[PDB]
Amino acid sequence: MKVGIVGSGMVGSATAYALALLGVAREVVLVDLDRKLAQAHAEDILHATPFAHPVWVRAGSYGDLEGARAVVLAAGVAQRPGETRLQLLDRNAQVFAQVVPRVLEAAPEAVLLVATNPVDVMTQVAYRLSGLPPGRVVGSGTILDTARFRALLAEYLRVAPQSVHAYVLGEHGDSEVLVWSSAQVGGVPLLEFAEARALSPEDRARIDEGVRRAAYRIIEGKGATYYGIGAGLARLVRAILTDEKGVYTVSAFTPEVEGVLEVSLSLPRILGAGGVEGTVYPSLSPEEREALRRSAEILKEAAFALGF
Amino acid sequence: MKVGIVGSGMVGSATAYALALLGVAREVVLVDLDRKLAQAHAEDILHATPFAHPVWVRAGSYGDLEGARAVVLAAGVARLQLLDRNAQVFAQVVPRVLEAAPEAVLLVATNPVDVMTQVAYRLSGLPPGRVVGSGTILDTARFRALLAEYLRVAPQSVHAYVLGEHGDSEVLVWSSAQVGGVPLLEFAEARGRALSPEDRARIDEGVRRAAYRIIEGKGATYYGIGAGLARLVRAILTDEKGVYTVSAFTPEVEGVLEVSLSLPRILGAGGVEGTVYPSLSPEEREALRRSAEILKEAAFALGF
Amino acid sequence: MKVGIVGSGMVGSATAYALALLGVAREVVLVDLDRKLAQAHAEDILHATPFAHPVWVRAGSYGDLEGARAVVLAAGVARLQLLDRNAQVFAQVVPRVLEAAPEAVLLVATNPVDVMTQVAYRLSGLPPGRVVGSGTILDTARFRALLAEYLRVAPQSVHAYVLGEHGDSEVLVWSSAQVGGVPLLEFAEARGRALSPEDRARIDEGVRRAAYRIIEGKGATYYGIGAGLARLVRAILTDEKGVYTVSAFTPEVEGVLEVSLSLPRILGAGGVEGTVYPSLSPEEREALRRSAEILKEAAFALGF
Amino acid sequence: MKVGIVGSGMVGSATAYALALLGVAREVVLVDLDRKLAQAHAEDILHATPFAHPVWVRAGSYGDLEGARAVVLAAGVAQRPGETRLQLLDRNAQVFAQVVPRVLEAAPEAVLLVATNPVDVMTQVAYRLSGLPPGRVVGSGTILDTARFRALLAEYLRVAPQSVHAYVLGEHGDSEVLVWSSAQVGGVPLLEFAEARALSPEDRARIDEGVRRAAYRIIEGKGATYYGIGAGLARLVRAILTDEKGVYTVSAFTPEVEGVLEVSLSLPRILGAGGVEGTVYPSLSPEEREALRRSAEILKEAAFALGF
Ligand SMILES: NC(=O)c1ccc[n+]([C@@H]2O[C@H](COP(=O)([O-])OP(=O)(O)OC[C@H]3O[C@@H](n4cnc5c(N)ncnc54)[C@H](O)[C@@H]3O)[C@@H](O)[C@H]2O)c1
Numbered sequence A, D: 001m002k003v004g005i006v007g008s009g010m011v012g013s014a015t016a017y018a019l020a021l022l023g024v025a026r027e028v029v030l031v032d033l034d035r036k037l038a039q040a041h042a043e044d045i046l047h048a049t050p051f052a053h054p055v056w057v058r059a060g061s062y063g064d065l066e067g068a069r070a071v072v073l074a075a076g077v078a079q080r081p082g083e084t085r086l087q088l089l090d091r092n093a094q095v096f097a098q099v100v101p102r103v104l105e106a107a108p109e110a111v112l113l114v115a116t117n118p119v120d121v122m123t124q125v126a127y128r129l130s131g132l133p134p135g136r137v138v139g140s141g142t143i144l145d146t147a148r149f150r151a152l153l154a155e156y157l158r159v160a161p162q163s164v165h166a167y168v169l170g171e172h173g174d175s176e177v178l179v180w181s182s183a184q185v186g187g188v189p190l191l192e193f194a195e196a197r198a199l200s201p202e203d204r205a206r207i208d209e210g211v212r213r214a215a216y217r218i219i220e221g222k223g224a225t226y227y228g229i230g231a232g233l234a235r236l237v238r239a240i241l242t243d244e245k246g247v248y249t250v251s252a253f254t255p256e257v258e259g260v261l262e263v264s265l266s267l268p269r270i271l272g273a274g275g276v277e278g279t280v281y282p283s284l285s286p287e288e289r290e291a292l293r294r295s296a297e298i299l300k301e302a303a304f305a306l307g308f
Numbered sequence B, C: 001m002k003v004g005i006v007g008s009g010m011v012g013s014a015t016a017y018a019l020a021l022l023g024v025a026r027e028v029v030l031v032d033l034d035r036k037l038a039q040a041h042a043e044d045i046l047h048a049t050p051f052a053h054p055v056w057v058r059a060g061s062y063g064d065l066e067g068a069r070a071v072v073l074a075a076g077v078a079r080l081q082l083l084d085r086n087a088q089v090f091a092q093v094v095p096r097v098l099e100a101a102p103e104a105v106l107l108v109a110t111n112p113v114d115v116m117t118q119v120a121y122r123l124s125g126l127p128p129g130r131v132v133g134s135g136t137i138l139d140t141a142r143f144r145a146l147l148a149e150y151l152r153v154a155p156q157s158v159h160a161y162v163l164g165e166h167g168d169s170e171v172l173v174w175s176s177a178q179v180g181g182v183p184l185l186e187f188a189e190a191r192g193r194a195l196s197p198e199d200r201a202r203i204d205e206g207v208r209r210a211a212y213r214i215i216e217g218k219g220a221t222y223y224g225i226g227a228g229l230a231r232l233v234r235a236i237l238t239d240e241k242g243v244y245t246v247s248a249f250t251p252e253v254e255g256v257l258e259v260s261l262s263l264p265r266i267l268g269a270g271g272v273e274g275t276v277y278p279s280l281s282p283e284e285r286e287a288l289r290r291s292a293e294i295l296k297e298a299a300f301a302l303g304f
C-alpha cells in the first residue's frame, strides 16, 4: 500500500524516514512545491532502505498520489520576522486551500493526516476545505505528549508503559490537559495504586513539565521538532493501513466538546482504515473538564478569527 | 547494549534516530559541546521511542560514554585546509573518547571518511581494526539495489562491490559482480535483461552522483548514512562477523602503503577482523591504486 | 541471553520454537532424560533458525543450564494421584535446576499450573516471586481478543482479566473490564455493539472451553502455551516489569492462606514483583475464593 | 493476504504456527479431511497470536481457500507396516489427485507449495495433476539443507551466514549434492579463501554429515520433522506474498537437468508472486555434475514407476 506526504520538509521527510525504517508501507510518495527538495529527500532515504526494509520511497506529483490510503499534510510556511500570528496562520490556511483539493483530486479515498503546526487549527482548516465527513481528517494532536505522559508515569511507578493508561487531551500545546483523575495502571486507579505499592504535587508538577514543555525545550535548542512526530505519524499511518481500530488521542473535528461547538482538538479516538471511527470519553474531574473547556475555547477562537 | 555518538548535528542525530527506530541498542548517548543541541535531539528522538523500541536515548559528556561498545564520530563540517580543521577536532575527540570507553570500536562518519579514518587511527593508538570508517557501504548497497531493480531479482542475491575512496574515485567492481554465483553479465543476459554499456553508465551515475544530487536540492545528506551507520553498529553489537565495504587502515593496497580506504571486510565486536580481496580487472586495479595514492598524498600532507 | 527448558515434549519444544521464531533469547537449552528426544527437537528447530533469528538452540544436561536467567518447567503428563507423580518429578527437577542456575526464575508450565507452581515454590526454597506459573495468560488474552473482535476495537485497548485457577474455576472479571478507561458494557453500548447476556455466555464458553475443544480433536495443546510462555520469558529477560495474569504463591487471597493462583502481577528480571488487585463484584469474589480453597485442599493433600 | 494449507498435520500446523509468529500473512486457512483436527490446531495457534502478530488463523473448507495467494500441500498418508514404498507413494499420489483439483477449483491463481515427503516426487505429481505451467508448483526441496550447509560453513569460517554462498541441489534426501566447488564467501571462492584466512577431507565429511543426516537424526529420536520445514515454508510463502524474486534451492518440474528429462528436483530458482521465475545454474564440477545426474535419475525412475 502507498502513503502520500505533501510537504517534504523536516516533519515530512522524518515521517518518510520512519515509515521506511519501520516498514509500515510498501510505497511512500513525497510531494513538494520544491521538486528538487522532495527528490533529494527520497533519494537520501532510499539509501537507508537496504539497511531496513524494502520500501519504495520516491518524490512525485499530486497525480502520483493515486491509490494512497493515507496522505500526510506537512506543508506550511515559516513565519516572517514581524508579522502577526494570525497573519502566519492565514498564510498556512492558504497553503491548505491549495493542497487539500489537489490531494483529494488524485486520491479521493485517502484519509488526511494533518501534521502542520498548530495541528488542531490546521486540522479544522483541513476539515472545512475537504468536504469529507469529520472522521477522515485526522491531526496527530497530542499522541506524543500522551505517550510521554505514560512513559513518565511508568518510570515513576517502575512498571511498563503498556500497563499505564493515561491521556493528554485538548489543544496540542500549552493548554493541553493531563487527565490525572482517571489515569490507570493495570485497570486500577493510578493515584490509588501509587499511594501504596504515591504522587505528591511536586511529583505531578515535575511530570507535567516533562510533558508540557518538551516541545518548547526541543525547539529552544534545535529550532524545530520532527523526529518525534515522524514516528508518531508513522504509527498513525500503520493504524490506518492495517485498519487496527486502535485508540489514540488525535485531533479531529468534534461536534461539541464540553460546551464549545464545532472545534478540532485531541480526544481518545478509535483509528482505522476510514479515519477516526468513534470517540472514547474517559472520566474527567471538574478541574480537568474546565481545562478542556478552556483549551477548546482558545481553539474555537482561533478558528473564528481565521474564518473556519 | 550501549553506543555513543559524538557530534549532534544532522548525521549524528539521524544515526541515533535510526539506532532507536530499528531497536539496535539499549542505550544511545549523544555528545556535543553544544549541550542544548544534543539534549534537544535526544528529546526529539525520545518522543519517538514509545512508537518503536525501548531505547534510552540521552545527551551526555564524554564521561557518559563509559562502557560503550561502539562510538560514532560524526563531528565537524563536510578543500585541503578543511581537512586540517576537522583533523584538529579529532585530535581533541579521539583521546577524550578512548579515555572513557577504552574498549569501544570507533566508527568514523565525518567526511572525507577515508582520510578522517586515517587520522582517527593514528590518533587512537589502537590496532588498525578498531577504527572503522563508514566508507562505501551506502554506494555498495545502492549498486546492488539498482542491479536488483534492473535484473528483477532480490538485492540479497546480488553481490557487487564499490571499493576505494568514498567519492568520485569510487570503483564499481563490475568485473567480479555476481548473482547467485553466476557472473552478473551472463546472468543478466540469461534473464533477458542484458546490461548494455549505456545501462551500466546509467547505473554508474546512479551510484556515483547520488550524493551530489542530494546536496544540490537538499543541502546535506544524513538519512542514508544514519541507517547504514546503525547497521554497522549492529554488526559490532551482535559480533555479526558479516562482510561490509567499510574504510580502515590498510598496510598495503595495489601498491601504496599505510593508507585507509574501503574494501570488503569482516566486522565484529572488535571491529574489522579480516579482509576479503575480490577479483579486480586491469582497469579496476588501476583506479583503486590511483585512488589509493590520492588518499595517501592527502594523508601525508596532514602529517598522517 | 540464555533460557532453559526442562521437559522436551510438545509443550517444552513448542516453547523453544516460539523462543526461536520470535528471537527472544540468544541461547535456548532443552533438557530431558530422553537425550535423543531433546536433540531431535533442538535440531528440528535449528533447521528453522536461518529463516528467523540467530538463536542457538541445543540439547543439554542440567549442567548446561548454567547462567540461565529463566528455566521453563514443562515436564510430566497433563486425577489426584497424577498430581503426586508429577510432584515427585518436580522434587527431582527443582533441585537439579537451582543447582546449576541458582539465580534463574522458574516458569512452571506443567498442568495443573496452580498446584504445580505451589509444589515448585515450596521445593525451591526461593522467595515467592521467583517461581512463576503460566496460569491464565492464554485465557486473559483470549478474553480480550474476543471482546476486541466483538466490539471492533484493537486488543491493546481492551483491558479484561481471567483470574484464579486455570481451568473451569476460571473467573472472567467482567465487572471491572474496561476499554480505554471506560466500563466495558457502556463502551459496548456506546459503540452500538451492546453485550447481551447471551453474547457474554458465548464469549465465556469461547474462553473457558477452548482447551477442551483443542484436546478433543487434536489430543493436546502446545502452540498457544508455547508463545505465551515465550512472552513471559521476554518480560523476564528484558526486565519488562509488565503486567500478566500469572500463577504464583500468594500469602492470602479472598480468605484462604498460602496458595497459588493467577492474579495480575508485575513480571521482571526477578520474577513476580508485585500484585495489582482489580475490582471484583460479589459473585466474582465468591468464585475466586471457592476456587482458592479448591486449590488449597488439593495442595494440602499433596503435603504442600 | 491469505494463505492456504491443505493437510493439517505436524508439518501443516507447524507452518501455520510459523506464519503466525512471523506475521507473514493476515489470514491462514487450514483444510483437512479431519475437520476437528484442523479446528483444534487453528484454535491452539490462535491462542498464540496475542503474543506475536494479528494473524487470522482458522480452519475451513476448500471453498474457504478463495483468494489465497499460495497454498501449502502437506496432506498425505502414513505408511502401513509391511506395504512397499511404491505402494505408499501411490497412496499419496491418490491423496494429491483429490487435493490439487479441489484447491485450484477454489483458488485458480494460487501458487502450489508442495511439502509432503518425498517432496521431489510429490512435486512432480502435483505438477502433472495441476495443469499449470511448471513455475507455479514449488516444492520446499533442499532449502533447509542448503541453509544448514551455509550455517556450518560460516561457523567453521567464523563469518556470518549471509556472506556465505553455498547450495545443496538435487533430491531432497540421501542423494543430495553439496556444491563445494563453486561455494563462495564474499564473492570469493570458499576453498581458496579458507586455505588462507582451510578445509580438509575430514572437515568436509563432518560438514556433509551435519547436513545430509540431519533429517535422519531428527526422525530417529522424534519420529518426524516439522519445526524446520514450518519456518522454511513460512519463508517461501513470504517470498511469494511479497513478490521478492529471491533465489532459493526449491523443487520444480525441470525440462532437462544434466541429461535426464522432465523431472522435479532442487536447483537455485528465482521465487516470486507467480512461482518460480527462472533457474540459476551455478558452476558444477565433474563429480558434482555426476552426483546431480545420479540424483536426477533416481527421481526420474520413481516418477516412471508411479506414472508421472
Ligand atoms: N516542527 C516544528 O517544530 C514546527 C514549528 C512551527 C511551525 N511548524 C509548521 O509545520 C510545518 C512543517 O514543519 P517542517 O519543519 O517540516 O517545515 P519546513 O519549513 O522545513 O517545510 C515546510 C514544507 O512545506 C512545503 N510547502 C509550503 N507550501 C507548499 C505547497 N503549497 N505545496 C507543497 N509543499 C509546500 C515547503 O516547500 C517545505 O518542504 C511548517 O510549515 C510550519 O508551518 C512546525
Ligand SMILES: NC(=O)c1ccc[n+]([C@@H]2O[C@H](COP(=O)([O-])OP(=O)(O)OC[C@H]3O[C@@H](n4cnc5c(N)ncnc54)[C@H](O)[C@@H]3O)[C@@H](O)[C@H]2O)c1
Pocket (backbone or CB within 6 Å): D006, D007, D008, D009, D010, D011, D012, D013, D031, D032, D033, D034, D037, D074, D075, D076, D077, D078, D092, D095, D098, D099, D115, D116, D117, D118, D219, D223, D224, D225, D226
Ligand atoms: N515430516 C516428516 O518427517 C515426514 C516423514 C515421512 C513422510 N512424511 C509425509 O509428509 C506428510 C506430512 O507430514 P506430517 O507429519 O504433517 O503428517 P501427518 O501424518 O501428521 O498429517 C498428514 C495430514 O494430511 C491429512 N490428509 C490425508 N489425506 C488427506 C486428504 N485427502 N485431504 C485433506 N487432508 C488429508 C491428514 O488427515 C493429516 O492431517 C505425511 O502425510 C507423510 O505422507 C513426512
